[PDB]
Subunit: 227 residues, 6 copies
């Protein structure tokens, strides 16, 4: 029995759009038909409504692997099995501009903690999203003529430990942006059998309005989610 | 400049009581004189008021090491340097009862992400609270005739990876309870030069109402913070 | 200058089909127009010719991460920058039949050795193939009406290492097959800037040792797949 | 049965003051009433007598984690369960003068063999002394008007290992001194169920190699502190 | 049934000289009496014949730990139990000249996959050759009046990641040369009960005629194997 | 200036026989000509005298890697450069009887602090003795008709954590006995340029005359040191 998200079974859809910021969940709920607040416990706002004749929920996951792991596990216990994370990220390469999008194809991460507790050892398990769902995202973002890039990201655990040596190291490893929850989402999804994907809004560039960019892409994500 | 906690510098006190649940922050603010909401961005509610002739803030830190690390770093950037975490925990031994308290003397943890990024290697740095501040807590709880225990806790990163083997392993290692933020709080405080401590309310017992226990202990915590 | 693959300037194409078995490299070369043996030093056979009127090369990479790492580095020094591995694999799930194909989307691996020397620490860098090239492969195989599955694989370093929980461990982690070079191929490519992808022919099923197939049916599978792969490299 | 400390039933007290130097164990035994040598095998001297009308023992633990682990395990088999280590240390901060004292609140350490063998994995288990016993030491030292500091220490395994940033590294991590046995003492105690604490006499300052102390002044410091320690052990 | 070395049962000797290069195996087979090619699959050439009235085989092992592991395992399944590797190496000390020989007494290695899969943990198991067999090699080489040095070598997994800082680091760790298969050979042999050793021909010096060297040594090696 | 071994410069020989037990050091000193005690500090007894027309020292190293490292370092600062450890060990194979000897060819060890502090990373550096010195030991024990076995040993750090699962694990990894200082001695010697070896007396057999045995062996050891 979930102890963080206090929604009743049947109040959470199988399809869920997950965001870190409670405020974004509230803003994006205005895109659903007849949205209802199914949970507010511990600040994790969850809204359930309709979109393209499909029931969908928008849920808050907070910051970090431990936080999103808990939210995903409990949403799953209430019926969810398809998740698409819509967050913000810091670009690691110069050519990507603010307000543009990144569709994630994989996540790099440092071993330990959460991963050791779930996997039982330090093996580097491929942290990747569902192949088909990610391709649908690309197709959806193209249909809407939105500027996007496709690549891997580094899921950091320490926001304030990202210096300059940091940027060169990670971009030289094939990552084009940094965020904090993708590796946990993809890996846990692989173990639990959930279908997940992620699209990010570039809010900063470490190598070198948000709300407007957020709204445009949210519609592309919702279309993908309900397709 | 902080991008999560949007409080104006000067609106955050040097002394801060930190809690994981936004709802508890709101509930505990009623114990302050003339409380003002100084931040609500991303759901991290921060209240600032007075207590026993001292300015004090009550801040939300969310769940997990990555989350509290961000909140502490930003509160510190706004002026804070003394932190006392007041959370909930699951007892790992049979004799501790629900509603009783645990004053923390140390935190065990699994190596990984956050710690590697801050410490730069995998050394096991002693994750302990400020000695003087912790003794003051013990004195305050005794004065108010509250039932407490003193011991180490295990700071877990995966709430849903805690099985049977789990309880015996950690209690046999000298830990009497499990929570998720103490190790990050103590270690980062040692590195940043902050004075930190922690008191926990037992909400569950893994070996074998909350609001009531929470309110009683909050006063002892605030007395300690303003002494 | 390369000390294993002794090829001269302009003899290696930019686009290369890489396989572990030199016997297969020779066999596949017969699908090209006027194939020329560019290298045979240390057994690493490399042929260069044309397909659909396009210049391409087929090279041998041997067994394991250390071997394919050396071959990829020297081939790139000779001018290559696009690599598609075409090999064999063992399925980790019961529903995949022998002779079918697996288009790789990522590779799991145990930390250490080669990765520590190249990456300088033990971070788990995402080991994935080029997004676009992989989708081209999916398109090519479906147009050839071939049966394939899409998923991650575990790149093992010890073919004969015992683990009474092997199949269950890796299959429970999202992997549908096991081989030995993909992690090295994908990670080294991300670090060096090469575009890589991988397609594997199921030559055995570890989750069901009851099934089997003969070379007549296997080589047949290898041949049909090579055509789809070559189409993609020439696209 | 113990194979290092050859003592009989009842020769070892429940409360034990442990020191690394057998020469110090002998010297300190003169503070007890009717001291009796209960062991001398392998150089690990153990004396048993009375202080303030209380039976206690002073034992030698040698240098390093592996050594003190063996000694503590055998002393416990002989009946001991309360241990207070009293040793020497090197300060990692400039403001601590030689001859002063450090009451340990925790110990930092590098993952390693000893801990892996006992813990069965590499988790960073909190290495802390008994809360109450440590507070008794603080009270005792202040009542004897002695200058002390409270803080964490780094338990090193390599006295002569080179590290250009040693002092800066550990002091920046909240440690004010370095020694070699505390982490093993605290962790093994938590695991076995013993009550332990530690008090150290600063015999050098790595953050200031300029200051020095003479043997007469030092032993003087050791003597004074030992009284406070013994008061606590017999409280 | 071995899937790489398809030699017939009885076609592989108990005594085996292993080399990484197929061409060297071919070239060395001319030192045997009545040599017959017993395997060609996957390029792993294996020849079997006689020398000093004893049956002996010369096998190709390819490049790297994973490759030699497979070959050794299958050769053993076919009856081999004594292995002597004859390869090339890069000197890490300036006093060793090209063409001279190095008789290995131990192998340094970085912890990694292969060792983890076979050992089941990160323990540093001593990677050493058979003591008696190694002394027989020393005798054979001095008897033929050859110039050799006895010492430890570093078994690298990444040929193209061995920069300059490389030389100082490994030479200061007691290693006088670098190659890529010795650690695997020695450790696997200790676990399986095989008797192994290694002699190397210096083909390069990273701190600072050939054909003849290879041939000269091969004869000293064959005498040892058949002693 | 060494702070543990207070011997005067010139009072310590270049050739040193090291033992863990102070009592054995005292006992073995009677084998030297005109033995003089050169150090007593901290219980680390050191005697110096002559044997076969050569200056030799017998030093106490205490128990464990950290202890022998300190002693070896200070003895070297005083002029020692050739070390031969003579200790006791527990056999890991049933065919080795009490009182017999084991000449060590290598040492297995678990990654740990001491090796990390000296090596600066987790690399498994070959922990082996000097090849020449070890062969001289074999010769010495043969000329005296003593029963010995050559093989690798496991250098444990936790004496009281050596259960039964223990025996099968290390014996299957090619180790024939367990002790506590060889890994440290061999690795530190390789890094420092010292020549070291080790002979052990089997005191116990975990798979299934300490006076007389020790004495008989010590003589073979002293002959080797002065050859
Ligand atoms: N520069 C950045 N580094 C790490 N996370 C970032 C960054 N920019 C945005 N984020 C994302 O936004 C939140 C932190 O602001 C986290 O949930 C994280 O996923
Ligand atoms: N059983 C438990 N395991 C881990 N954290 C717990 C437990 N009970 C309460 N907590 C604390 O409460 C939150 C999760 O409920 C986290 O912030 C954590 O610190
Ligand atoms: N400098 C070197 N570094 C690594 N391996 C080498 C070197 N020189 C020769 N080799 C050996 O030759 C092959 C690499 O050319 C491998 O099988 C390896 O054992
Ligand atoms: N069974 C054993 N396990 C570990 N060390 C042993 C054993 N037998 C003898 N020793 C050696 O003797 C001492 C422990 O009695 C240590 O110095 C160690 O090297």
């Amino acid at each position: 029995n979930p102890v963080h998200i206090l929604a009743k079974k049947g109040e959470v859809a199988e399809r869920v759009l997950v965001v870190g910021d409670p405020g974004r969940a509230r803003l994006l709920s205005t895109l659903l038909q007849n949205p209802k607040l199914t949970n507010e416990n511990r600040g994790f706002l969850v809204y359930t409504g309709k979109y393209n004749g499909e029931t969908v929920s928008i849920a808050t996951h907070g910051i970090g692997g431990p936080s999103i792991a808990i939210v995903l596990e409990e949403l799953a216990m209430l019926g969810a099995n398809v998740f698409i994370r819509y967050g913000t990220t810091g670009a690691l390469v110069p050519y990507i501009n603010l307000g543009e999008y990144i569709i994630v194809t994989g996540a790099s991460y440092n071993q330990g903690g959460l991963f050791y507790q779930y996997l039982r050892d330090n093996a580097c398990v491929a942290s990747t999203p569902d192949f088909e769902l990610t391709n649908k995202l690309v197709t959806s973002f193209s249909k809407r003529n939105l500027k996007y890039y496709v690549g891997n990201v580094f899921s950091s655990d320490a926001f304030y430990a990202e210096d300059e040596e940091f940027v060169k190291k990670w971009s030289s490893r094939g990552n084009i942006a940094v965020e904090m929850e993708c590796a946990t989402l993809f890996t846990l999804s692989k173990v639990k059998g959930w279908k997940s994907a992620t699209v990010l809004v570039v809010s900063d560039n470490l190598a070198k309005e948000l709300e407007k960019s957020v709204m445009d892409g949210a519609k592309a994500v919702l279309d993908t989610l309900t397709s």
